[PDB]
Amino acid sequence: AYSFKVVLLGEGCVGKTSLVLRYCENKFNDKHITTLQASFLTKKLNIGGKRVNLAIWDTAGQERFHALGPIYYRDSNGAILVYDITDEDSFQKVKNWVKELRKMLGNEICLCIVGNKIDLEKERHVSIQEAESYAESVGAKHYHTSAKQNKGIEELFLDLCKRMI
């Protein structure tokens, strides 16, 4: 069986927790229940008729992750950097995450840049075009999700797994 580790990154408002909660438990909250500690969640997939065990890590801040990373996260096979399509400050802050991540981990890890909250399209404040160009130029693939409406999520994780394989 394959065993993979994936870590979730991005600013508060973005929906890291909502992404992995929806995926692993099919649950969602409108309340922002802020993530005080590293948490992990699991998912058994099947790809090429082979069982894939997936541990998904959800993080409690840039500073904590930054101090913990070199000790506790150097064996990560993928990383999902999330931003909120309705929040410009959050997408621009992804650059910070990409660099810091790569300044700590190999390039062997598969990066995803995730524009979450596509149920709020009417409030879009981030150009698809700009985000896609950014993803492409750091070797990340780009993805759109809604955790609230459960769209993009199963595909995001499956593709990340195919990639990590």
**DSSP per-residue string spanning 18-43:** HHHHHHHH----SS-----S-EEEEE
Q: Under the criterion CB under 6 A, does residue 90 sit at the interface with ligand GNP?
A: no
Task: Find the binder of ligand GNP among 104, 138, 148, 158 (CB under 6 A).
Answer: 148
Letters for 16-35 (x = contact with Mg ion by CB under 5 A, - = none) are -x-----------------x
Residue 55 or 120: which CB sits closer to ligand GNP?
Answer: 120
Q: How far apart are CA 37 and CA 60, in angstroms?
A: 5
* Helix runs in the chain, H state only: 16-25, 62-72, 88-102, 128-136, 153-164
Tokens matching residue 46: 């099947």
- The maximal CA–CA distance of the chain, rounded, in angstroms, is 43
Q: Under the criterion CB under 6 A, does residue 115 sit at the interface with ligand GNP?
A: no
DSSP-assigned letter for residue 3: E
Q: From ligand GNP, Mg ion, none, which one binds at residue 12 (CB under 5 to 8 Å depending on kind)?
A: ligand GNP
Q: Under the criterion CB under 6 A, does residue 117 sit at the interface with ligand GNP?
A: yes
Residues at the site binding ligand GNP, with contacts judged by CB under 6 A: 12-18, 29-30, 32-35, 116-117, 119-120, 146-148
Residues at the site binding Mg ion, with contacts judged by CB under 5 A: 17, 35
